[PDB]
Amino acid sequence: VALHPPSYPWSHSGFLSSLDHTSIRRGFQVYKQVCSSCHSMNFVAYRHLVGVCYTEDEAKALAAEVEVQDGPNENGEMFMRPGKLFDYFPKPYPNSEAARAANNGALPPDLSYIARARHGGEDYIFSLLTGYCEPPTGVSLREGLYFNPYFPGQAIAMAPPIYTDVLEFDDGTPATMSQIAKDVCTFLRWASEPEHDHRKRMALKMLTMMALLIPLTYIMKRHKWSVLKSRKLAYRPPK
Amino acid sequence: VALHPPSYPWSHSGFLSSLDHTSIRRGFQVYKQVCSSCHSMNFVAYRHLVGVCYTEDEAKALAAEVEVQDGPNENGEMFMRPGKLFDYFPKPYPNSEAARAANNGALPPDLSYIARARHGGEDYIFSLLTGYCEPPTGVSLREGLYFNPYFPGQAIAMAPPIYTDVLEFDDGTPATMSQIAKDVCTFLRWASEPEHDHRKRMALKMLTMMALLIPLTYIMKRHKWSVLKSRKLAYRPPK
Amino acid sequence: GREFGNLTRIRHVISYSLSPLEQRALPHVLSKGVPNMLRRVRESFFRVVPQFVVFYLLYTWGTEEFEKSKRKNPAAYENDK
Amino acid sequence: GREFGNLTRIRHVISYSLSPLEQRALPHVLSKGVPNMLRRVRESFFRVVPQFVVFYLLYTWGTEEFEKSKRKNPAAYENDK
Amino acid sequence: TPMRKSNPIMKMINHSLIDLPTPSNISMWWNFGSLLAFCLILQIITGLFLAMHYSPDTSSAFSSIAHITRDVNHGWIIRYLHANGASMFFICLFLHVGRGLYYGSFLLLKTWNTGIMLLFLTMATAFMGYVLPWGQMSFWGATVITNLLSAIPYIGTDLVQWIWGGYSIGNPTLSRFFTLHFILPFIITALTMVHLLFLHETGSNNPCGISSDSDKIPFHPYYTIKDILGLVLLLFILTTLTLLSPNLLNDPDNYIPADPLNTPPHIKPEWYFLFAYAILRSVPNKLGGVLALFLSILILSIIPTLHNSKQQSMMFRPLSQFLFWFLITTLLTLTWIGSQPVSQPFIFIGQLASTMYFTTVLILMPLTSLIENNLLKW
Amino acid sequence: TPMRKSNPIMKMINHSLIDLPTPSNISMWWNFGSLLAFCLILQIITGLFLAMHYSPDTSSAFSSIAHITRDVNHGWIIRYLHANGASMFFICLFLHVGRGLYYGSFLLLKTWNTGIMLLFLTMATAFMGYVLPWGQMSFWGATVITNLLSAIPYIGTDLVQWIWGGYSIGNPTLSRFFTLHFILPFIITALTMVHLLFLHETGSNNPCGISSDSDKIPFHPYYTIKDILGLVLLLFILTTLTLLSPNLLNDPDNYIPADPLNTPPHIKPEWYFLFAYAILRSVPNKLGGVLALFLSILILSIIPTLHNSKQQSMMFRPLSQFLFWFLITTLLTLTWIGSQPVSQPFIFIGQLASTMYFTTVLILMPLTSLIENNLLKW
Ligand SMILES: CCCCCCCCCCCCCCCCCC(=O)OC[C@H](COP(=O)([O-])OCC(O)COP(=O)([O-])OC[C@@H](COC(=O)CCCCCCCCCCCCCCCCC)OC(=O)CCCCCCCCCCCCCCCCC)OC(=O)CCCCCCCCCCCCCCCCC
Ligand SMILES: CCCCCCCC/C=C/CCCCCCCC(=O)OC[C@H](COP(=O)(O)OCCN)OC(=O)CCCCCCC/C=C/CCCCCCCC
Ligand SMILES: CCCCCCCC/C=C/CCCCCCCC(=O)OC[C@H](COP(=O)(O)OCCN)OC(=O)CCCCCCC/C=C/CCCCCCCC
Ligand SMILES: CCCCCCCC/C=C/CCCCCCCC(=O)OC[C@H](COP(=O)(O)OCCN)OC(=O)CCCCCCC/C=C/CCCCCCCC
Ligand SMILES: CCCCCCCC/C=C/CCCCCCCC(=O)OC[C@H](COP(=O)(O)OCCN)OC(=O)CCCCCCC/C=C/CCCCCCCC
Ligand code: HEC
Ligand code: HEC
Ligand code: HEM
Ligand code: HEM
Numbered sequence A, B: 001v002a003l004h005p006p007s008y009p010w011s012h013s014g015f016l017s018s019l020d021h022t023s024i025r026r027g028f029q030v031y032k033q034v035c036s037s038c039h040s041m042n043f044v045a046y047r048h049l050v051g052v053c054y055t056e057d058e059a060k061a062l063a064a065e066v067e068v069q070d071g072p073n074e075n076g077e078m079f080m081r082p083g084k085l086f087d088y089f090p091k092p093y094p095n096s097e098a099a100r101a102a103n104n105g106a107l108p109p110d111l112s113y114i115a116r117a118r119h120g121g122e123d124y125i126f127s128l129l130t131g132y133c134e135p136p137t138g139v140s141l142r143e144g145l146y147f148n149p150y151f152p153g154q155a156i157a158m159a160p161p162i163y164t165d166v167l168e169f170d171d172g173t174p175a176t177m178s179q180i181a182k183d184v185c186t187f188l189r190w191a192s193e194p195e196h197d198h199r200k201r202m203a204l205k206m207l208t209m210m211a212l213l214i215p216l217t218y219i220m221k222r223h224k225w226s227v228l229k230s231r232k233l234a235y236r237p238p239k
Numbered sequence C, D: 001g002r003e004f005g006n007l008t009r010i011r012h013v014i015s016y017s018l019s020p021l022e023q024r025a026l027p028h029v030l031s032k033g034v035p036n037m038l039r040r041v042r043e044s045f046f047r048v049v050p051q052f053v054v055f056y057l058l059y060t061w062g063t064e065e066f067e068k069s070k071r072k073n074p075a076a077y078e079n080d081k
Numbered sequence E, F: 001t002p003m004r005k006s007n008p009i010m011k012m013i014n015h016s017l018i019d020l021p022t023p024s025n026i027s028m029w030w031n032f033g034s035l036l037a038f039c040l041i042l043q044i045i046t047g048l049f050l051a052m053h054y055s056p057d058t059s060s061a062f063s064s065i066a067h068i069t070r071d072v073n074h075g076w077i078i079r080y081l082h083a084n085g086a087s088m089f090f091i092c093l094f095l096h097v098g099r100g101l102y103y104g105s106f107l108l109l110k111t112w113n114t115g116i117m118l119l120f121l122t123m124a125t126a127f128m129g130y131v132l133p134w135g136q137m138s139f140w141g142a143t144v145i146t147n148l149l150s151a152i153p154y155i156g157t158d159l160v161q162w163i164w165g166g167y168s169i170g171n172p173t174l175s176r177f178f179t180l181h182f183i184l185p186f187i188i189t190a191l192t193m194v195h196l197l198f199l200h201e202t203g204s205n206n207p208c209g210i211s212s213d214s215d216k217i218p219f220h221p222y223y224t225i226k227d228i229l230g231l232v233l234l235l236f237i238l239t240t241l242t243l244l245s246p247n248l249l250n251d252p253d254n255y256i257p258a259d260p261l262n263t264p265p266h267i268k269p270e271w272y273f274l275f276a277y278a279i280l281r282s283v284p285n286k287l288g289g290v291l292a293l294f295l296s297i298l299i300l301s302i303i304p305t306l307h308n309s310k311q312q313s314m315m316f317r318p319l320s321q322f323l324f325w326f327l328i329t330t331l332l333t334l335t336w337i338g339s340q341p342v343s344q345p346f347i348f349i350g351q352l353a354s355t356m357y358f359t360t361v362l363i364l365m366p367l368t369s370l371i372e373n374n375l376l377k378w
């Protein structure tokens, strides 16, 4: 059975710790230049990047880079136009049969909730991305599979997707495989759960309040029940 | 305002009269050869003709005459195949913009409930089909309109669709314009309300029953109330 | 609360009844019921009917007037040219 | 039905009470309440706890056994060739 | 004791409809409450079935009903029954109200007020069901009824946009209509139970308007069989409407799907609403129009307050009766005007009918009651 | 009189929760009914809101929930609250049952039977909500639960196909799940009212098992503030579960949409069901398995019949107490076994746990009660 991922010290794992938005910005470049060849992200749109790592104008600029189908026009025909904020990240394949045809029968999953749809979360993915190696003695792989101990079965269709200097970050960070993996993983965390930071923000407040209300109402209860708690009885028959 | 259609004596208008299925069979040929060039019938499929005027085998035969898009195939591509019982009558245009482009801006409506969606029902349609004529003095028509007194406005985009010998019926009936109109109208009646015959069938039964139950329960009521209806009072004070 | 034991206080009233199986359910229709219905119609006729007659006159008038209003007036073209 | 006027019949019982505003809400915690809780734990310990201890032993045993069952047996390859 | 009286649930049933003391002399006009309950039950059942095939989405609503009426086994008759049952429901409702106006049963204040609440709830429900098919009439009905709150001076437009869930009528509004139409009938049921609870504390009024405690009979067997007879009659009428003449009340313009860019030239709501529509059409001012629309129904709440007569019922009060039937004809007139184009004869007639409706309820009846009192010398 | 007692509605409220006589000495174990009611109310509210954005269609259900959690303002927390409230609901339910088993309150027969009905209804409801997201676990849960009726020997397969509405699980089944999940909670509400009606005819049992009519106190103010305290505590726990650790009880396999061609290797229902699952897994025969599954809950109905003790409560009965806690551990064991693969150690352990559950309820407790009686010399 599959190998259990170890726990990495992620800076957002504290009870009130927020995500590192720099790592999100770099992870998103990783997902543009590499991982959006095979994979779809059907539930994210450019308008979602605004106020997270981009202004509205710059997100429009990202959008503009992509052609999108639209129509019908006044003649009843379809056409192509540049993108807008309200368009969803584009799909790599038109249908899953075409996706299988382009990957030797295997279907790459959608990464919009991959971090919440796998045991271990971002610990697993990192483990999977860094974890390829040569197989043991006695093991063999059929046509077009790789070996990876952190996959269930240890045979996986996906070739090692990243290596050192497979891209360059615009902030000058050195692009070693490990750095790339950590950053794309942070970005998938954000893609799976946007409410993260605001949720922790809101916890502080309303937990303080609900904690405060316990002793107060307990005092009120004790006040009303003191009458019975100190009551004294006696029995006085005429005998 | 529009001209009020007169009432024609249609053989199905009696309380327990059924539709004439011969006229349905001919009307359906009219709708194939003529009226399915412009118009859609999105809510009827070949399986619906079975047991009305066709066997299952012959309805399959009708189906087989038409090409239909299907897929994706194992490669991820679409293809064309012959039709089946469970396919819907084919559309003439891909979208309403294309329909307008092919009819000088006007949009032909769907005839699946045309008989229930117009004042006068099949009296109107017949009136409209037979009713074209030359305009009065002082009247003029803009580019591409005809005159027809039974249309609201009296200007209509649709040119006179039928004339004598615009088709030939397979049962040898002489195809005069009037005959064609009456038959297509019967067919539209059937297309708008398939439950017709069975509904009247079922009325006879359950109306007989509900009519029978009235006097019986009235008798039971009278039986229980006779005690009070014949009661006699008296007042006898000691005085 | 309200119960058949203590609704009101009554004295010196006598009642008589037959059983349903001793008597007829529709004893006298055409000799008693029909004239009774006739008087029952008589006693209410003039309190109900004339209002509806007035409604009918108003309805027909208003229909006629509306339908006249839609016909072309010859003086609209004949008068000045 | 059940109402504070006629629940039961009692004779010769006397009661005494203070008002809440005359007395304290948490009068004696560490000198009376704590020992009371301690005896209250003592009186029930051996009626509840050992069953759960047995559950814990069973759980750990079954886990260990299942995990042993997944490891390869050397005699399955060494014995005959 | 008999088991009939051994137990709270059973004893409540017994006090409700076995040993309840009812007047001996009440007439057919008292059958319409039980028919109302029957209609509510019919509607809930047929609705739960329809629900399992309908689609609360603007891109498939219409076609889901097409699917119901063409492919589901006997789905057409279930549709027919639902639609005709609503009509019967309102027929009974109107007759039920009118009885109480004639025979003075509004002096049972709690029952009367809970009745007014029920009227309002039923109307809301009926309207929110009428927009679900998403035909051409449904769409514009929705539009008007949701723009009504724009008349509130300070907060209205924001209320409209908060009910729409967007810049305009659209997909988010249809699911709201459907959730509300699902939940309301059950609130109606609960309030009906409260209504009857209030009634059974006093008992039924009767045609003569004098106390009937000297001649009470039990509810069973007399009124049990009487109401069963009434139900048989209602079912005969409903079946004939469903099978022999289903298209009598039907509207063709709702067999054309919705088009947000075109309102049809001739507009007409469902029949049980026409009269309000006429009233709404009669005031040349927005706010005043809406105010009149709502007051037309809310005015029932002050009828108990304007009562001057020594006697309760109109049975012995002829001038009163004459006015009553004149009021009913005013309402017929409003119904007729609602059907007609907004053109000059009908405009003027509608304005007169409206002024006479309020006039009659608020002024003429009180004064005739005083005259009557003086003629009997008290 | 005070207005408190002037009027039927008010006087029923007063007899319910103002002047009701309650035992002075009942403990925290009696707070869980009010928390159950609170939970029902919370569920209905959050459900009515969710309803207005969800899509009962197999081609958009999943994505409608995605829409709710990503685009609707604070929709994520409404989702979180609904899902965690169900869990709290069952926690309270289990504790509520256990109290009554320990303290002998099953001798209130009507209340106990209506409780069993409510348990069944709540379980149905919870399960029919669990399949609405149309994830990978939801689909196969649906499949199994609807194949259960195939075990009926003469008519079963036809029942399965009549519930499906077709040859297989599909679009026509999801709308049925959604209609039923919509309507059941309100039936639960009505039956809860009947439940309490039955309770208030006798009043509450207490820890000592002896009659408390010498020391009754009024419900207000004592138990009003006590239950308010309980509610505050429940809200603290619920908030911490919703905001600080939302993924504690969550299942990853339901974040993969449904695939009719593949069942995942490791299957696990929602936690409050595991134990039944284990029981169902323990019988090597189909019909016998289903029979055991249903008897596991239906067996509560004969506990009143097997009662031999002279005393009502276990407070003074130590051997009894020992057996009670052993039973609770058997149920924990079934819960643990439900989580594990169907492999040999767990197979054998589950079979023992099941036999011991029924054994204990049906045999050991009656006999220990007789021994106890003999030790006290009666
Ligand atoms: C990041 C997340 C953060 C989460 C933070 C959460 C914070 C929670 C704060 C909660 C504060 C509550 C305050 C309530 C005040 C109410 C006052 C009142 O009136 O109370 C009456 C009520 C009792 O009512 P009663 O009228 O007496 O009736 C009860 C019985 O009938 C009486 O019968 P009896 O008298 O016979 O019984 C006597 C005895 C009976 O004793 C026994 O039966 C014996 C017990 C022996 C135990 C021995 C030790 C353990 C076993 C060891 C055995 C040996 C092992 C050997 C192994 C060998 C292996 C080889 O029982 C007791 O005395 C029990 C007292 C203690 C109750 C503890 C309650 C725990 C609540 C936990 C909540 C968890 C959820 C939180 C939310 C989490 C969200 C993620 O309670 C009390 O009197 C105690 C009040 C104080 C309770 C404090 C609880 C604090 C809990 C903190 C938890 C933090 C960790 C959370 C972890 C979460 C993991 C997911
Ligand atoms: C196997 C195929 C199906 C077979 C079906 C067989 C049953 C057919 C229908 C029978 C209907 C019932 C008729 C007999 C009812 C007798 C009721 C009775 O004895 O109780 C009356 C008495 C009246 O109360 P008091 O007024 O206090 O009396 C005092 C008198 N001085 O008691 C009551 O209060 C009523 C009690 C009602 C009990 C009803 C029991 C019903 C049993 C139905 C069983 C159906 C089984 C179906 C099996 C289907 C296949 C698995
Ligand atoms: C599908 C389209 C539906 C259209 C709308 C349908 C509903 C409206 C129907 C209107 C016509 C109703 C006619 C009813 C029959 C009238 C018979 C009649 O005049 O009989 C008078 C006869 C006289 O008897 P008494 O005075 O008691 O004394 C006799 C004993 N010695 O009976 C009566 O007067 C009883 C009157 C009872 C009330 C009748 C109410 C009828 C109209 C009610 C609905 C009107 C609309 C709503 C009104 C209230 C609005 C706030
Ligand atoms: C314009 C901005 C908003 C302004 C809001 C102003 C109101 C603020 C809130 C006020 C709350 C009410 C406080 C006073 C309540 C008085 C109740 C009273 O007098 O009745 C007590 C007495 C008690 O009964 P018994 O026990 O029989 O008494 C016998 C004694 N030996 O009567 C009762 O039974 C209770 C009657 C309750 C009446 C309550 C009336 C509430 C009125 C609310 C108006 C709100 C208006 C809001 C307007 C908003 C803008 C359009
Ligand atoms: C999210 C995951 C949720 C997992 C499931 C959660 C629910 C199950 C929780 C199981 C553990 C519950 C422990 C509760 C505390 C026990 C404390 C204890 O032993 O105290 C004993 C103390 C002794 O007091 P007395 O005998 O009254 O005398 C004292 C006065 N002189 O109190 C008691 O014995 C009271 C017992 C009341 C009932 C408790 C029931 C606990 C379990 C209930 C749920 C179990 C599952 C369902 C059972 C029924 C199935 C048909
Ligand atoms: C085409 C060369 C791909 C690129 C570029 C990336 N991935 Fe992919 N991935 C691909 C295939 C054909 C598969 C199927 C594997 C199988 O055995 O079926 C996958 C799968 C994944 C998974 C799933 C892991 C699991 O346990 O199911 C993940 C999490 C994944 N891929 C991630 C991922 C990332 C981060 C990439 C960019 C760095 C990436 N993939 C690129 C094909 C291709
Ligand atoms: C293309 C040459 C057409 C053929 C063949 C038929 N119809 Fe048609 N129709 C066409 C157009 C462009 C329009 C729009 C008219 C307009 O003014 O917008 C129509 C319209 C109709 C209608 C609608 C009548 C109404 O009052 O709205 C009907 C009922 C209709 N057409 C019927 C009909 C029938 C029976 C035909 C076969 C005999 C037929 N049409 C053919 C274009 C064309
Ligand atoms: C769903 C709607 C309603 C239902 C189900 C309903 C039901 C009933 C029933 C069953 C009765 C028993 C007596 C009878 O049938 O006459 C009744 C009586 C009564 N109803 Fe309602 N009703 C409804 C709406 C209304 C409305 C709209 C009003 C008034 C505007 C009203 C006012 C009354 C009154 C005053 C009585 C008692 C009058 C008398 O006994 O003389 N009800 N109702
Ligand atoms: C007082 C009770 C009710 C009234 C007055 C009422 C009224 C109506 C009306 C007038 C329509 C439109 C009819 C048409 O378009 O032809 C409708 C549609 C509908 N109603 Fe009801 N209804 C009631 C109860 C219910 C209930 C309890 C449900 C439960 C789900 C329900 C579900 C539906 C559905 C799904 C539709 C759309 C199907 C269709 O248009 O045929 N209804 N309702």
Ligand code: HEM
Residues within 6 Å of the ligand: F029, F030, F031, F032, F033, F034, F036, F037, F040, F093, F096, F097, F100, F105, F106, F108, F111, F112, F114, F115, F116, F118, F119, F122, F188, F192, F195, F199, F203, F204, F205, F206
């Ligand atoms: C929605 C589900 C339920 C609700 C809302 C509910 C509600 C209540 C409430 C508010 C009480 C008041 C006393 C107390 O809180 O202890 C109560 C008592 C009671 N409940 Fe329920 N309950 C439910 C389910 C059940 C179940 C499943 C059972 C048994 C299997 C049950 C049996 C009882 C009994 C026997 C009592 C009275 C016992 C005593 O007073 O000693 N109830 N319930």
Ligand code: HEM
Residues within 6 Å of the ligand: F040, F043, F044, F045, F046, F047, F048, F050, F051, F054, F065, F079, F082, F083, F086, F089, F122, F125, F126, F129, F130, F131, F132, F133, F181, F182, F185
């Ligand atoms: C006892 C009351 C209720 C219980 C126990 C209950 C339970 C549940 C559960 C367990 C789920 C699935 C949670 C998940 O997938 O994460 C659910 C979903 C849902 N329920 Fe409730 N529910 C109740 C009341 C209601 C009511 C009254 C409605 C009214 C419409 C409702 C509407 C919904 C909807 C629309 C969903 C799907 C949305 C989603 O999965 O997040 N529920 N319910």
Ligand SMILES: O=C1C(=C2CCC(c3ccc(Cl)cc3)CC2)C(O)=C(O)c2ccccc21
Residues within 6 Å of the ligand: E016, E017, E022, E030, E033, E034, E037, E038, E196, E199, E200, E204, E223, E227
């Ligand atoms: O029809 C009723 C009536 C009631 C009979 C039972 C009905 C009913 C409706 C539905 C069900 Cl499932 C059961 C009973 C409701 C109306 C009731 O309470 C009265 O007080 C009354 C008084 C005079 C004339 C008729 C009546």
Ligand SMILES: O=C1C(O)=C([C@H]2CC[C@H](c3ccc(Cl)cc3)CC2)C(=O)c2ccccc21
Residues within 6 Å of the ligand: E123, E137, E138, E140, E141, E142, E144, E145, E267, E268, E269, E270, E273, E276, E277, E280, E293, E294, E297
């Ligand atoms: O113009 C209208 C209109 O004015 C209403 C009106 C009718 C009266 C209604 C009404 C509102 C409140 C009450 Cl208490 C009673 C009726 C509100 C909608 C419609 O129902 C309608 C339907 C379809 C197309 C257009 C229209």
Ligand SMILES: O=C1C(O)=C([C@H]2CC[C@H](c3ccc(Cl)cc3)CC2)C(=O)c2ccccc21
Residues within 6 Å of the ligand: F123, F137, F138, F140, F141, F142, F144, F145, F267, F268, F269, F270, F273, F276, F277, F280, F293, F294, F297
């Ligand atoms: O194999 C099962 C299975 O057996 C059940 C079972 C659990 C017990 C349920 C149950 C039925 C009736 C009662 Cl009274 C209680 C629980 C029925 C479904 C599931 O819930 C399940 C969910 C998802 C995938 C597979 C499965």
